[PDB]
Design a protein around this ligand. Structure first.
Ligand SMILES: Cc1c2c(c(O)c3c(O)cccc13)C(=O)[C@]1(O)C(=O)C(C(N)=O)=C(O)[C@@H](N(C)C)[C@@H]1C2
Ligand SMILES: Cc1c2c(c(O)c3c(O)cccc13)C(=O)[C@]1(O)C(=O)C(C(N)=O)=C(O)[C@@H](N(C)C)[C@@H]1C2
Ligand SMILES: [Mg+2]
Ligand SMILES: [Mg+2]
Lengths: 197, 197
């Protein structure tokens, strides 16, 4: 035979970069792979399945700060977790739209479970931990979808502050903005814990 | 003749809901409107132009907390601005993907300019103001793209904390998560100002 699932997914990651999330189809993956539709069907049963597969495997491949390191404060962890998640979303074309709307995978259960436990052990109620992890994902993803969709935008007279505001944001493709509000999020949450009185 | 730009855009808003951002095309707008391509062309010259038009007009129509109200702290403003932006993104199918990657419009220059001035007058450096407005948009947009792409996901065994974490997030389609981390953002920034010593 031929097809192991990781080869299929690797071809799918190449295709995503070549044609983007919209033009990525099951039928096109089968072209690139050199195979019939119903042999692909056993690995990836529809487009949704395929996209969920990319979402996961992109994180398996490039999202390595999944867990607090022995020397880390929950502050450190959150920072380095979020940075790692963002570079991982930036790695692929439409990486932000690939992730959006997924839920963590079986391959991510033990670490994601751990991320929440780690936050509960830090002082946070569950809700709080859930909302903080969730929302740092949303923040990061929003940051990445915007900068990705922006530089893909080939369109063809701001006021003073707005001119600088947009200059500042086109400069680093959103880096400093990201790091700053990650930092205010983490101080925000610090104040949540200080709300033990 | 027939076509004023607002009728075209109104038809485009109906279509977006009917077919979504991917299936929305210039050629399809012309169908719905009852008109030839090159007569549409004068209002909306390509797909990008069209999408930028939706992005703006959706905010013109549904994003009404553009400015601090006489009785508002910058805290109040940011909160109510962000809430207003999010409900505005939720109003349309793919509203989050319609906004992503745009830059504020001519119709938004005087208010957006004002939002930054207002923040500078509050104590924030420009950078800070730019990063806070930018990033609250990113946060809100990420929050909305995720919940929208999620409920559109018709796919067909979590651990304990993860089971609750996801239950909590499917409950309110992300509301409480949003309000909580908006609140920690705004406390985060409060600490930025306390960093005048
Ligand atoms: C806790 C949680 C997370 C995620 C998530 O999508 C999610 C959800 O959809 C419902 C309830 C909880 C969560 C993440 O996407 C994820 O990005 C993720 O899978 C993840 C990962 N695989 O390690 C992370 O590290 C997290 N980090 C970016 C905050 C975050 C954790
Ligand atoms: C300041 C700013 C903003 C936005 C933005 O896209 C942006 C940018 O792309 C580069 C530099 C600055 C900004 C907004 O989208 C917008 O959503 C917006 O247009 C906007 C609006 N039209 O009133 C807002 O109220 C803002 N709020 C959600 C923080 C935010 C303001
Ligand atoms: Mg996720
Ligand atoms: Mg914007």
């Amino acid at each position: 035979a031929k097809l192991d699932k990781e080869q299929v997914i690797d071809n799918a990651l190449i295709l995503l970069n070549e044609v983007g999330i919209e033009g990525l189809t099951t039928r096109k993956l089968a072209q690139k792979i050199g195979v019939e539709q119903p042999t692909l069907y056993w690995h990836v049963k529809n487009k949704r399945a395929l996209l969920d597969a990319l979402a996961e495997t992109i994180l398996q491949k490039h999202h390595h700060h999944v867990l607090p390191l022995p020397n880390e404060t929950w502050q450190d962890f959150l920072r380095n977790n979020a940075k790692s998640f963002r570079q991982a979303l930036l790695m692929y074309r439409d990486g932000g739209k690939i992730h959006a709307g997924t839920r963590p995978s079986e391959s991510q259960f033990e670490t994601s479970e751990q991320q929440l436990q780690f936050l509960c052990d830090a002082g946070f109620s569950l809700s709080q931990a859930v909302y903080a992890l969730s929302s740092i994902a949303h923040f990061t993803l929003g940051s990445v979808l915007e900068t990705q969709e922006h530089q893909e935008s080939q369109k063809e007279a701001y006021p003073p502050l707005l001119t600088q505001a947009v200059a500042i944001m086109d400069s680093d493709n959103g880096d400093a903005a990201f790091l700053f509000v990650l930092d205010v999020m983490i101080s925000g949450l610090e104040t949540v814990l200080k709300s033990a009185k």
